[PDB]
Amino acid sequence: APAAVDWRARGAVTAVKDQGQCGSCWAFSAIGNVECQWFLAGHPLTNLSEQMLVSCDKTDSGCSGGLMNNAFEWIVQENNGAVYTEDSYPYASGEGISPPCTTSGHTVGATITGHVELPQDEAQIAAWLAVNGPVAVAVDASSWMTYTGGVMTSCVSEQLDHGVLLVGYNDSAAVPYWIIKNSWTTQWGEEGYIRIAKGSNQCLVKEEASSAVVG
Numbered sequence: 001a002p003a004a005v006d007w008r009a010r011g012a013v014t015a016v017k018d019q020g021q022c023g024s025c026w027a028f029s030a031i032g033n034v035e036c037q038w039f040l041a042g043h044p045l046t047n048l049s050e051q052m053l054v055s056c057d058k059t060d061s062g063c064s065g066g067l068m069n070n071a072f073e074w075i076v077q078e079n080n081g082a083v084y085t086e087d088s089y090p091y092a093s094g095e096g097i098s099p100p101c102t103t104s105g106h107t108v109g110a111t112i113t114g115h116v117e118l119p120q121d122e123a124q125i126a127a128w129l130a131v132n133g134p135v136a137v138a139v140d141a142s143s144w145m146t147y148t149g150g151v152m153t154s155c156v157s158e159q160l161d162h163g164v165l166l167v168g169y170n171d172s173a174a175v176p177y178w179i180i181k182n183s184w185t186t187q188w189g190e191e192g193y194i195r196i197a198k199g200s201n202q203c204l205v206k207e208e209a210s211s212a213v214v215g
């Protein structure tokens with residue numbers, strides 16, 4: 001695999017968002033992955049709707065959590081693979097209360113056919129990302145509240161409780177790392193991103209990696 005990859009540099013990643021006081025991280029992880037996969041399939045980079053998942057994804061728990069894999073499946077099996085645009089279905093759960101699910105007056109921004117779950121191995125996840133793009137991953141973000149910058153070489157890895165987006169890595173660095181897009185605004189970390197050591201399963205990053213499949 002290539003020594004270093006950064007999908008942000010190739011214009012495949014949308015701007016860092018804000019989930020607010022809602023535990024909708026799972027939706028941001030899933031949608032963020034779909035936005036990248038849709039762009040890479042030959043369509044212009046479009047901001048898609050997390051709110052669609054938070055409000056309509058009944059297999060998940062809105063502001064109380066969910067799984068990216070459940071979100072991928074709900075989109076395909078319950079929503080005919082349709083993912084609405086953000087402009088047509090704006091995020092409105094920033095206070096902690098999700099509004100009811102509305103199925104009309106929205107615009108379909110992307111369509112997925114399914115999803116693939118990657119092996120629990122960092123080198124294989126890196127290989128897949130290098131060829132296919134950003135990957136949605138679950139991590140333990142307990143120690144992330146105090147992150148200000150730099151490569152996190154020591155991360156509390158006890159329980160999966162947060163969803164993020166892997167956008168790259170650098171194997172040639174003194175301490176190889178992963179580049180991760182978070183959803184706690186650009187004021188957190190390095191303009192919304194966090195770099196964690198690669199190769200030691202920091203924050204349980206290899207445990208639940210997956211990606212939507214467009215075409």
Ligand SMILES: *[C@H](CS(=O)(=O)NOCc1ccccc1)[C@H](CCc1ccccc1)NC(=O)[C@H](Cc1ccccc1)NC(=O)N1CCN(C)CC1
Pocket residue numbers: 022023024025026061063064065066067068138141142160161162163208
């Ligand atoms: C996103 C969480 S976050 O609020 O952005 N960060 O939390 C970091 C943190 C800090 C201290 C302790 C623990 C975690 C969401 C929050 C969900 C939430 C739960 C309860 C109360 C408020 C908010 N995290 C999730 O959605 C995770 C993501 C995940 C994906 C894949 C695999 C594991 C985890 N999932 C869940 O919380 N659940 C809820 C219960 N159901 C059964 C499964 C998904």
